[PDB]
Amino acid sequence: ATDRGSESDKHFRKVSDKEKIDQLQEELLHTQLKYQRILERLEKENKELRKLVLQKDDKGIHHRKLKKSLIDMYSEVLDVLSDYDASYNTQDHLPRVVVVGDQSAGKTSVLEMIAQARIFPRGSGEMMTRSPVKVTLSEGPHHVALFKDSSREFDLTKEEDLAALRHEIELRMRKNVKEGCTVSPETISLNVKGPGLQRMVLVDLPGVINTVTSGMAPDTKETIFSISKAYMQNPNAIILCIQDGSVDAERSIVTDLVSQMDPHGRRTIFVLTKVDLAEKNVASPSRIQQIIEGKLFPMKALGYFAVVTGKGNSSESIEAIREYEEEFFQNSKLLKTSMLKAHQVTTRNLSLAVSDCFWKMVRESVEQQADSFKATRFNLETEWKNNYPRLRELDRNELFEKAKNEILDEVISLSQVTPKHWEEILQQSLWERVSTHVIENIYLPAAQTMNSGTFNTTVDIKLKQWTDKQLPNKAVEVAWETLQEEFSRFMTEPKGKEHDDIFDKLKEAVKEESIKRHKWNDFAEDSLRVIQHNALEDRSISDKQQWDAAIYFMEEALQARLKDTENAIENMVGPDWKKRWLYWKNRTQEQCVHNETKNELEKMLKCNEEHPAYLASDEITTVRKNLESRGVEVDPSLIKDTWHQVYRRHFLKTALNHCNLCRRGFYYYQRHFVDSELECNDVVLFWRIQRMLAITANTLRQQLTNTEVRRLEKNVKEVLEDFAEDGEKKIKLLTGKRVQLAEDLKKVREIQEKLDAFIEALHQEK
Amino acid sequence: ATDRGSESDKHFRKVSDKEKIDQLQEELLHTQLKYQRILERLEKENKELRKLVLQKDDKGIHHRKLKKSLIDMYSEVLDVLSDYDASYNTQDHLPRVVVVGDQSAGKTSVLEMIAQARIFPRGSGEMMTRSPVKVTLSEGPHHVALFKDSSREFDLTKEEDLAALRHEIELRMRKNVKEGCTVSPETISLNVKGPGLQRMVLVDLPGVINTVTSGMAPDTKETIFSISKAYMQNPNAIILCIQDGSVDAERSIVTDLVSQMDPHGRRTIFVLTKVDLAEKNVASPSRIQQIIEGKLFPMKALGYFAVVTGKGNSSESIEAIREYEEEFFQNSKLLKTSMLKAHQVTTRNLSLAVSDCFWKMVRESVEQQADSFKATRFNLETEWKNNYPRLRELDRNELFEKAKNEILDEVISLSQVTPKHWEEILQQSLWERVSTHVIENIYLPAAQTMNSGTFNTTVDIKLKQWTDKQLPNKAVEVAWETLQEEFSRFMTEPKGKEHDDIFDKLKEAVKEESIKRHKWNDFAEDSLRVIQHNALEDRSISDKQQWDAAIYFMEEALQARLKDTENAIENMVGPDWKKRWLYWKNRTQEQCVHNETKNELEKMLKCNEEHPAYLASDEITTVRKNLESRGVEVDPSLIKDTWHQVYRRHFLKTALNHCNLCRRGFYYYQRHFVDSELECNDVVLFWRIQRMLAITANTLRQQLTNTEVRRLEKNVKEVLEDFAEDGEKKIKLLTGKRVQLAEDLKKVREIQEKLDAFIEALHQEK
Ligand SMILES: Nc1nc2c(ncn2[C@@H]2O[C@H](COP(=O)(O)OP(=O)(O)O)[C@@H](O)[C@H]2O)c(=O)[nH]1
Ligand SMILES: Nc1nc2c(ncn2[C@@H]2O[C@H](COP(=O)(O)OP(=O)(O)O)[C@@H](O)[C@H]2O)c(=O)[nH]1
Numbered sequence A, B: 001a002t003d004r005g006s007e008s009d010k011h012f013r014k015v016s017d018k019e020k021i022d023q024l025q026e027e028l029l030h031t032q033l034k035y036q037r038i039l040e041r042l043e044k045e046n047k048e049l050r051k052l053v054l055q056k057d058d059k060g061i062h063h064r065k066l067k068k069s070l071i072d073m074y075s076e077v078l079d080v081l082s083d084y085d086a087s088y089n090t091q092d093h094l095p096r097v098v099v100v101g102d103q104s105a106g107k108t109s110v111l112e113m114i115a116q117a118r119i120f121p122r123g124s125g126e127m128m129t130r131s132p133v134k135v136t137l138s139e140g141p142h143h144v145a146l147f148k149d150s151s152r153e154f155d156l157t158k159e160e161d162l163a164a165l166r167h168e169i170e171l172r173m174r175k176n177v178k179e180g181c182t183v184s185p186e187t188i189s190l191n192v193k194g195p196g197l198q199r200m201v202l203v204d205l206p207g208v209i210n211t212v213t214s215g216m217a218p219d220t221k222e223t224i225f226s227i228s229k230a231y232m233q234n235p236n237a238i239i240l241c242i243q244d245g246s247v248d249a250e251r252s253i254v255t256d257l258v259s260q261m262d263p264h265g266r267r268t269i270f271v272l273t274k275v276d277l278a279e280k281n282v283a284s285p286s287r288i289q290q291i292i293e294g295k296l297f298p299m300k301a302l303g304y305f306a307v308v309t310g311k312g313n314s315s316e317s318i319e320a321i322r323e324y325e326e327e328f329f330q331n332s333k334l335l336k337t338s339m340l341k342a343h344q345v346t347t348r349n350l351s352l353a354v355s356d357c358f359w360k361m362v363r364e365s366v367e368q369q370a371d372s373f374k375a376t377r378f379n380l381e382t383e384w385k386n387n388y389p390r391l392r393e394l395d396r397n398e399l400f401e402k403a404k405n406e407i408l409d410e411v412i413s414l415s416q417v418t419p420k421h422w423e424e425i426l427q428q429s430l431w432e433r434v435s436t437h438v439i440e441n442i443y444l445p446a447a448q449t450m451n452s453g454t455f456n457t458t459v460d461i462k463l464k465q466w467t468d469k470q471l472p473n474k475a476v477e478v479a480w481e482t483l484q485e486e487f488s489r490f491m492t493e494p495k496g497k498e499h500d501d502i503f504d505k506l507k508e509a510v511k512e513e514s515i516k517r518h519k520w521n522d523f524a525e526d527s528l529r530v531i532q533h534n535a536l537e538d539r540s541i542s543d544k545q546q547w548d549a550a551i552y553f554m555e556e557a558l559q560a561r562l563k564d565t566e567n568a569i570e571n572m573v574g575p576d577w578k579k580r581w582l583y584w585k586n587r588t589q590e591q592c593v594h595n596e597t598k599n600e601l602e603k604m605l606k607c608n609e610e611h612p613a614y615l616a617s618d619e620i621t622t623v624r625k626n627l628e629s630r631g632v633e634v635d636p637s638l639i640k641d642t643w644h645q646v647y648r649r650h651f652l653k654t655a656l657n658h659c660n661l662c663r664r665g666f667y668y669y670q671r672h673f674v675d676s677e678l679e680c681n682d683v684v685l686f687w688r689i690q691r692m693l694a695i696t697a698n699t700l701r702q703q704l705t706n707t708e709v710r711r712l713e714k715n716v717k718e719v720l721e722d723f724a725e726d727g728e729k730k731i732k733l734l735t736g737k738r739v740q741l742a743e744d745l746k747k748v749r750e751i752q753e754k755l756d757a758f759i760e761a762l763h764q765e766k
């Protein structure tokens, strides 16, 4: 009878097994223990069956050391790195090839005529590049590129598919840009296969703008510079410097961006675009001869200075661009009358030369990263472990689940609270809430008559009306709060000096959802009304012990009121001579008035001890004249306020003296046959309420332990499952700086594997 | 200007004038004044004597003094006395033409013989006359009728109006008779005029059954006898016994009743229905002759007449009665054998014998009804003079008006209550409500940490959440309930002896109605939330006096908590030896066990006075084993609860000593360049709590006095209007037994005036 919710769950839980254990045992334990093992061993078979078919498309199985997915290893390493750390602290050490040049140059053309002319939005009229776009190029058949690493199935040779693919990239480009600028560092990941593509990662960084026009947000050019740090602070970056062939080199921006990155040109190759505009204006090949020699290019870029040319139409196909480029370069005086042989100028030579320089840098510098990340992990683990010796290995998934079980365990522990605590806490809390209402609004005005029948009649009518409207509504609220008060203590209270504060955000977050769903039984009040009516209706106290308990607790309530009034009075009247002379204090003129106003009222009560609480205006006038006769002029309102506090002090002392004789007078045996005027009807009123609330608490406790705590437990389970799926809150709640460090350690460990996997793939040559 | 009465008077006068031209008086200019022309025209109509002369002629002698002046006025006297006196004990002097008998069909026919019109319910095989039906008969324009309170005139020569009269009578009978019975004493009244009518007042009473069949309630026969004795016991009434003539004289159900109520033959006249069955010998002719002569009556009788009717139909005219008077008696033995006398054949002789003796009884007996009227008025006025010298015709209207005015005045007085009292009581009530919530849920749990900064952080977070969710709702509850308390104090019995309870019914009903109809401002809680958040942000304390005030505030709260804990502890462990060996008491086994556990925990806390609230189960086991070594075995929860109580007591004593040191330090001076041992933070918290409570109380007082108190006053006025319009609620509320005495005195006076006018007219008739 102490608790019934736990028994119900066990009974039906066994029933479920008795009917379905022959299916549950296989699914719940046998399958799950083998499930993890088969992931390593049997999924291996299905992965290999498809992988081999995919490798045949790659040709990796057919040809040793030659596989189109071999270059995809390089991108996988960077994809983890960008997710692990997209900031300069990690990005600055990641090898890459970047397209750098004046925005007007159309610098991206170096990549458009390879694969991107079909799927990347282009054309003049507006700035196209909005954020770094990385394209993973690989020798292979035509295949729809990955867009934001998302799979696609499109034909790259038909306009209808390509147009939709151009839309997809544009959406990422603009969405990466936030208010205040037109460019964003947030990168876009593309991976395309097709003929003529080289194994390398080329990034089209947003074009630099000398000045921010009114058509662009003010921070455009500063943002591009910060994005330009992808190479300016990256010793592993290869820079393709694009000179806008429409304008002279002395008008360029790229010269300063790269010359401050590598003034020796060791990390860069200079490329020129739109050279054919030289013949749409008065061509000056003598300036081109300086261009090839790098006289006017401070970065002294190394390699052959390739040139890109195009019809300028934004619909020219990749094949059309290649054919146009070859014919123009092989005949134009810009290159035929200067030392720029077309077979070195052609973009396809740049793609090969860029691919050649790409693998040179990657193999040389990649091994340094493996040592760097390993050193990082050891330094992080040493400090992380020393500050958190308890957690040698931690994850945010492990952190959440521990709380999930811990929370459910505590709420169950809350369900283990004995009724003794519930009944005492509910009874004590509820009575204290309504202890003054009865005294001030029911008892004291009823005490103004000497007719005990009216006294009991008056209160009973008020109580029944009060009972119907207030008592069960306050009682449930106390019970609802009382359960939450213990729940919070069970939930988030520390175990002395040991406490995992890392879990407090989730615990309180779970509570708020669980209390919102904690709807107390809407009919609990109806039972209490019947109970309270019966508890009040039965006023028969035939037991001395019932009398003894009721009177002592009534005294405490009255003594509390007496001190409450007395403390208010002392402030109203101030210190007496004992404290005025002891602490060198004095009275305010109001306190002086109150003391004399008190004295006159005390004298009035000294004789008229039975004076009713209500004062006649003649008494108010009499006091005023009695005080005015001593030089004290008092507003009637002061007297009435003084009167109320002093009267209760007078009354309450009388009531306690009545209580003293009620217990003592009846206690003496020979006095029980003396019918004195000591009808302790207040003890009858107090006793019934004490019993009435005690029964109320028991009804609340029964509902508390039978229905409400189970609803609280059920809601917690519903909320915790929502949190289990709510990754963002789990991240937002689990921010303890050790799980985040543990998360970083995991990512560092993964990168070390990914770094070595690619490095291991480099070592396939020997 | 400062502290000058003249400025206050000028401000009050300006505001008063603005209110005088406000919307309250603006509406009256467009709703009341424009009808003063109609009021003036009505005054001119009232001052003209034309209406008074017309009333004198119409309500007195309109050329018919005997038939008109005091026949309808006699009916009014009877109606007013029956309204005042439900019983007939006071109607002995007022004669009536009473028709009683069995369920004979001729009961309807005799009443239509005297009231010569087919106006009475007609039926077969049933007792149609459920309830008494009064008809006033007199001369006037031929075949005209009236129905009391139906606002309709009836043509007695057309079937539609006679049917309307009968159907209205039947409907009133069906409303007088409740389910389960067929009869009801409630009356139905007609006013019928025609040249064939005498100055008579007739009552159509249910026939006697003396037995109940067909599922009818067994009380029906006693109800019938009571209805019929209400008149048959009237000394001045005239009783017409309707005898069914289809049976022998030996079967007469009503003879035995009149033989006891009228053994002297002074009222009772027997009439034989279905006289055609004497011609047919269906009924014994010998007994018919003897009843005509009167040899068969065991009593004296006033007379005997024949009921000259045949089965006929409901459409048969009165002249059918004349035709039967010719045919039955010229053809039958009733004259051929001289069984019946000629004057008994005539029903006009029955009508005249009843009418003349009826008015003779009127003139003989009605006059002396003034002696009992004067005696009743004397007794009522004597009771008033002895006990209620201030009591007047305090009927449903006067007491209601006085209570309404007192209620409005007391509500205005409430509306004028000073802000000081409002704010003080609001702060005290809200502190009573929130002190233990703060102490138990914020302060104590926070106290577990030694870092006052995290203590303050947790306290502020909990306070903000409590403000957002609970605090303003408790504040609004406090304001509303405090308003209710003051409103009840004004509305309910003043705490004196002068109160007259007679207004308590209306005062309490109005209080409940206005309180339940009152609604609080919707958005007070949002302002309170913002205000309380800002006040919480205000952590700047500079005055030692605020420090000490908050110290004593939280100190008194803490001492109350400490005493509660100590009393619970004493209950848990029982009294000490000082009482065990003084009052010869002892501890229970649980009490000794708890005392030993407390001693062990005290020893533990005397080595670590800073031990946290949480206990490890190893400490529980150690205490259990120590108790075993002391002969005591305990449940872990026993130790846990003892620890809870004693540790809280210890913490409270420690906090009280901490306050004792706080009052010897201060927020700023304890910290800067001093070796303070104090580190006091509770004072700031509870000082901020004091300030927030004071600000909330002041905001609540402003909202109250601006909107809510006047809203309650307006609701009170609306409720008073509703009660004024609600006659029934006034009837039930105003049952003070003095209202009823006033109503009885007024009604006795009215019947005395009607009787005096009636008797004066009677003397004018002689
Ligand atoms: N004349 C000429 N036009 C080019 C060349 N490369 C690209 N374009 C034109 O520039 C436009 C878009 O090229 P794109 O590489 O996207 O430059 P961006 O949009 O300014 O970054 C298209 O209309 C192309 O025809 C080139 O080498 N010579
Ligand atoms: N044969 C015969 N029929 C009568 C006599 N009096 C009345 N009736 C018929 O019975 C009906 C009696 O009316 P009823 O409603 O029963 O009177 P109630 O029972 O006293 O209310 C009339 O409509 C007549 O048609 C009578 O003396 N002889």
Ligand code: ALF
Pocket (backbone or CB within 6 Å): A102, A103, A104, A105, A106, A107, A108, A126, A127, A128, A129, A205, A206, A207
């Ligand atoms: F014109 Al660009 F990136 F070169 F938008």
Ligand code: ALF
Pocket (backbone or CB within 6 Å): B101, B102, B103, B104, B105, B107, B126, B127, B128, B129, B130, B205, B206, B207, B208
């Ligand atoms: F039949 Al009756 F009164 F209705 F005698």
Ligand SMILES: [K+]
Pocket (backbone or CB within 6 Å): A103, A104, A105, A106, A123, A124, A125, A126, A127, A128
């Ligand atoms: K452009």
Ligand SMILES: [K+]
Pocket (backbone or CB within 6 Å): B103, B104, B105, B106, B123, B124, B125, B126, B127, B128
């Ligand atoms: K009948």
Ligand SMILES: [Mg+2]
Pocket (backbone or CB within 6 Å): A108, A122, A128, A129
């Ligand atoms: Mg572009």
Ligand SMILES: [Mg+2]
Pocket (backbone or CB within 6 Å): B107, B108, B127, B128, B129, B130, B205, B206, B207
């Ligand atoms: Mg009848």
